[PDB]
Symmetry: D2
């Protein structure tokens, strides 16, 4: 069931959100927000800079003070607020999915059925953790009573990318709020709008003022202000590995703020000769092509055993030739645009290297349309490891298919990258599934599937694909700070 919005969407929220009120920028500047499918300006939004991030941090700090409503409320009540926010996002599902589709260049069916469903489910999952974050009592040596408090860390700076704006917003704020933190969020310059609507719902839900502050604007200004701030306790960032390195460096230089990073990948799939071939083709296909290839987990190197390689390439190419490009809001359209010019250019430039460096172009490999940042869905076979398209994250609808005959060697090739976000293994063999997934240097390893994400699992990168994990039980640890309290007593008993 794919319902739709009956009136044309109006944009309402375009201001900086601090202490549950709407602020003009300190400078008074505003910046335009575009639709990637039409190249048309949707609206303008208040440009947050260092001066605005400073207001936002001061409000977050005040909301975190000992004795404040947010610090003193029952953990169960933090949970209640989060489940209420999920109910409000569910109420505004049509509006939010439409705004998400229009601003993000994101197919509406997927926006409504997947992105919004995941947002609501992740929030409800995090709500449930709030009053289940626990420390320990510890049988220390000597006559002492020792316990630990898993406290909130404090003011968390949270920088969100443009590829899944709502999902990424909730992946940040859900766990941070569940644990009792206050946040300063910087949504992507390309996609501020859905986050500003969520801010209106945070107010409506009744979160105390200053617990969530949202400062739209650019990365090199508002994002740098966050990463270098002397009174932000933690920065969480999802985006490029390049910017990830700047974030971690700036945290080091400033106040040694805690860092988690969810970065890019060059994620490999290994398809064994005994694999269910159609299943492997279908998952590897969606694994690389989902949301116009703009996923950090993009299955951008597919190694297939030689005896099934030709059949794999043939079936993959036929699947890639089935797309219908267009405005992501029109029903039946199955591929929207890339987010912007910068990305569009990078994608086309990398497509040209595949041709020049000698990969076999099976289909696509150029642009589409008179308007909008559209790239034809592209497949390269006979890709080799030193090619640019095998080493660099494309972040576009461009599939690479490689051959292998040695399992020892293809695991080395899979692991021979600075990335390590995820990987896929396709086989019917129990031993192969376990041993290969153990040997892959990847944060998530899918077996006979790909791109299966859920709130109950931790998610994050090995190596330069990330630091730390988001979601699951394990992800909640990185939004707590552990305090040991050791009390002298006359005599302990076990």
């Amino acid at each position: 069931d794919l319902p739709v919005l009956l009136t044309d969407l109006k944009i309402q929220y375009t201001k900086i959100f601090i202490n549950n009120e709407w602020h003009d920028s300190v400078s008074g500047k505003k910046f335009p927000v575009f639709n990637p499918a039409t190249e048309e300006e949707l609206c303008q939004v208040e440009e947050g800079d260092k001066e605005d991030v400073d207001k936002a941090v001061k409000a977050a700090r005040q909301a975190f003070q000992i004795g404040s409503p947010w610090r003193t409320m029952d953990a169960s009540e933090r949970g209640r607020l989060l489940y209420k926010l999920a109910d409000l996002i569910e109420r505004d599902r049509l509006l939010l999915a439409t705004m998400e589709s229009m601003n993000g260049g994101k197919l509406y069916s997927n926006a409504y059925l997947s992105d919004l469903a995941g947002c609501i489910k992740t929030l409800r999952y995090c709500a449930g953790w709030a009053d289940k974050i626990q420390g320990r009592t510890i049988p220390i040596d000597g006559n002492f009573f020792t316990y630990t408090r898993h406290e909130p860390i404090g003011v968390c700076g949270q920088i969100i990318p443009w590829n899944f704006p709502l999902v990424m917003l909730i992946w940040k704020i859900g766990p941070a709020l569940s644990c009792g933190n206050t946040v300063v969020v910087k949504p992507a310059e390309q996609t501020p709008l859905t986050a500003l609507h969520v801010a209106s719902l945070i107010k409506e839900a009744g979160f105390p003022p200053g617990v969530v502050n949202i400062v739209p604007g650019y990365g090199p200004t508002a994002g740098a202000a966050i990463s270098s701030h002397m009174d932000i306790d933690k920065v969480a960032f999802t985006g490029s590995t390049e910017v990830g390195k700047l974030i971690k460096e700036a945290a080091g230089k400033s106040n040694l703020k805690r860092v988690t990073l969810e970065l890019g990948g060059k994620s490999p799939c290994i398809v064994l000769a005994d694999a269910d071939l159609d299943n492997a083709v279908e998952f590897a296909h969606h694994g690389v092509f989902y949301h116009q290839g703009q996923c950090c987990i993009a299955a951008s190197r597919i190694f297939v055993e030689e005896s099934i390689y030709d059949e794999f390439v043939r079936r993959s190419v036929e699947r890639a030739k089935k797309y219908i490009l267009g405005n992501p809001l029109t029903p039946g359209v199955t591929q929207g645009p890339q987010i912007d010019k910068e990305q569009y250019d990078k994608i086309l430039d990398l497509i040209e290297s595949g041709k020049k460096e000698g990969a076999k172009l099976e289909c696509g490999g150029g642009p589409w349309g008179n308007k909008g940042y559209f790239v034809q869905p592209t497949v390269f076979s006979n890709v080799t490891d030193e090619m640019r398209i095998a080493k660099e994250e494309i972040f576009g609808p461009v599939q690479q298919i490689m051959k292998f005959k040695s399992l020892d060697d293809v695991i080395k090739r899979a692991n021979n990258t600075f990335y390590g976000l995820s990987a896929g293994v396709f086989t019917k063999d129990i031993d192969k599934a376990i041993t290969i997934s153990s040997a892959l240097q990847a944060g998530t390893v899918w077996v006979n599937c790909y791109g299966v994400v859920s709130a109950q699992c931790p998610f994050g990168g090995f190596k330069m694909s990330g630091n730390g994990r988001e979601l699951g039980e394990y992800g909640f640890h990185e939004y707590t700070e552990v305090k040991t309290v050791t009390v002298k007593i006359s005599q302990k008993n076990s």
Copy 2:
């Protein structure tokens, strides 16, 4: 019972330890090691530089490869090796404590009774965790079987300070080895010797080659090589907050390696009017004066309620006047030297600011002896918050005593620092003990005691006193990397 070594100690191990064999430096240079009590050269040690760290990382990487003895052995057997290492350290307790005392300027009674006891106990504690590191099975949405592996991270670079060389060595290698990591250790330039003896015991215990590699040398060369290395997966560092910032920055610039930091402090004690006064004086005293003040947790700001302040200062001063300075090896001696000239100078310079900025000198405040980096035990009363001695870590035998009358205000003053390693609260009031310890922004809060450390507790800093925790159950998480494995199935059942 304080037994002693019957023969004069000979130094045997002075070389770089890689793949369980002793190496000369690549350059061929060596550097001198001194006794801080006599200023005399004890020996020379091979100077590890970038070229040597490179050999050490290659060996650690090879020992970590899938299919290696260290990766394939039973977790229970990693545990067994660690308990064997503890038995060997216990066997060599006299030798190790003597070498630790002589090289570190550390009182021998404390070296033997505390440092070595803590080393052995921490190793035995970590051994027990080895086969109890577990992932999860997770009821993900959809028809999937999801589990997680809490894998070792990989090659861990571990930089150790000079103040507790053996304890800090074991705090690093115990958890890292228990979890299945391989390590490259850089002991302090001042104190390489006890670590090199432990390396001989790692060989004797039967650890596979390359699992522990020890590279002595300087910080700006060997330490920088570690922090900037493109194939070290994690750096752990204990030391100054200043160097901590360089470590985190370099990790960011290079390969986004995981970082934990245990840094300095300016740790406060709050002594309420209802406190057991003698107990508060005794613990605050040892809290600041332990190991010539060379503890990151040094209780270097003692806030005392006004009505008991005079009596507190009087009793504290009398306790500080009871010390006997000398060579840390002579029985009855109760205060050894500072580690080196750099520290000695910093301590005296800060003592001079206390005088100049207007603190009341109660006792001490100059050097002692014709040889050795000795500082008289010093007490300042009427210290105020803007003084250098109230803001900067002294790392010397220098106590600061402050007065307060308002509990709200003294908690602000306690928290008004970029540090946050630890704190002390002294009171008989149940409510005060709980509420004050909750409000303090400190990693460990002691109630009616100070400096109670044990292997079962997590330990680390809030704010610029650290990132992450060492020891306890919680500390073991930062030596694992979490992998989610998600397997497609026909139908799941709860």
Copy 3:
């Protein structure tokens, strides 16, 4: 804010609830349900017997089969159903509290403000656990992959008492359903009605049929059928220790079904001379007198240090003389009736022993009113340990106050009972609070309070006050059955 129902309550649901449909009894018999305040018949309800429990178990077994909707739905969806049930109970709060008050003899202010609030909050807490129940991956010796599944146990028989009918219903079904079990509930013969309304809401919420089955009737028939059934996997019971022993015996005789028991108590309070006296009097008062003394945790032995004993008794007696007896539905009424004749008789008989055995009657000690099972609120001082009123659970509004001078001896006296549900300690001394609470053989120990219950804490008895725990993280374990899966592999890696 105490709102009320605008129309007089009508009873609608009076039938046995199996497979989400309403059933007449197999025999066709019905049994009367009374109001304890008027002694008047409210209605008749279908009498479940062994033959009906058999239908209910068959439905629960079918709902638990591998491949069923309840076994195959997402854990997150079990959670969703539970949060929906909580929303429906919140919607029907006025109706449920009124029915609870009228059928249970329970003061309406408390029914509405506490019982219903606790029901809703406990359900919401349990909902949050559903998709957070996890097994482990385990580094077993040898070349194996080992994981565990924390499965639901299966069909759980759940026997509920009359004193907190709704709260006890939700304490049973919340965790059992969160974990994926199916249930056969036997509410108390005195109080079937609110549970049958909840059954209508379980249907409305959309729980699959057979997941919850409710069989009203008597204990020696329907309760015995449950405890002795060959295809019930687990029995959970709250009630008398006497019946608890019959339940455990019958489980042993039949099919070794798993057992948890929440039984009675003779819970002690220790009031030290340094205690906040008014706080200790107020909490000890409500600790014994709550819900006409019909709490398993009733603070039915209050030991007070001699120097404050007289003042404690005086203040307690004045507090007990402030009650207004009457129909629990009338505003301003502060004490309702006992549940029934059996209990009423037992209470009066025990009150007579206090007089005869030589306790000092301070106030009360007889019945009240022309109708309804009312007992005057009673206080005995100078109670000694061999008295019946100091050994036996009264379950009525009858307080016992004792004196002590030796802390060693009063802890022995506190622990000198076969019971062990809970206890209270009142002191300002940190050491006393910790050491006394450690030494008490009680499941919950309150310090400077009493009767503080919350969903986040485990709750249950030491000794003959119970087996196992309900609620908290820990309580959820007893609604899972652990399966270890060990898979042969060619080679494991850490």
Copy 4:
């Protein structure tokens, strides 16, 4: 490497062990201990009865008192004592294995290489848990500080079977002691001797007196005394399901003591057509024939798919015909005797039913030798579900092989038993391995193996095969009793 004892074994310890001293029985009676291979009397042992169990419980109770050495020692020191006991068992490995072989009828190679290795490893595993048993700090509603203590339960009565006397002794005492309990152990009447030697080593290791008490004797006297004792807090029993029911009943009747049971089985294997046939034959073979079939996990129903059934039966029969019967002490001997006459008779009687009820006798099916309780290794093919040999636990060297063609139906047949200790699944199919192991109602499910037991895994039965789990992290919970401590505070902060 199978070394042996150089002198003939002498029996030294034959007395009741209470408070670390050797006691004659209260009656003064003694009972004979036999070698099952020769039918010859080895010695006499003091017969413990109710009067002796009473002495043992009083000593255990005193060792558990608040303030005792066992309650006040560091958890790390409980661990140390356990690792010391493991070292002493390792020292006496030859003596213990020989005594175990001679008294238990247990093949010496297995006694030395498996039983003693498992004893030592399990103890070392449990030692590591001692100072890692932790409670929680819990964010309860309202202004309270809540924590939990995972205390030892108290005096644990532990009844051990004859089939693995040392392993079962350590499986009981290891976790119970690690958690801080005191124990009264009743080893099997057939096999008291190795436990009494371990008692001498508990004394030598330096356990405080009364922490471990061992009372040899019979089950219907000493075992009943334990199960019905009013001051034993918990009973743990491994043995027959029949006696298991008596234990649970008696706990119910007496003092509602906590119960865990590890009972018998009729454990099934499902061998799919795609299985590695030789691996399935080898593991199913050892799965049923290990230790003369005297394992609770005996793979006593092997369901094989029809197309490989004939080949499976043929290969299995050839493997069963390779045994060499004799005294378990002679090298090359590969099958020892049954434990005693009672078991021997039961085995032969059940073998006769297989013949009479129409199973196909492939080999064996009678006794062997002039002396010793020897049974020929027996294989029945064409077994059907209503046969006695398919329903009843034989506990002898008797294999049952069945055919199936429907996977749905063979899972029903596998699950169609009151037992549920363990099961085996043999297949190369990933989906089959996961789905079948999920659907089996068995505590341990092995995939492509059988009888893989390790200290790191929990172990126990579904249904009438047991209550609770032993070993792993999960097993340690059943040796703790949880206390919630809830402290009133002025104001909480997260």
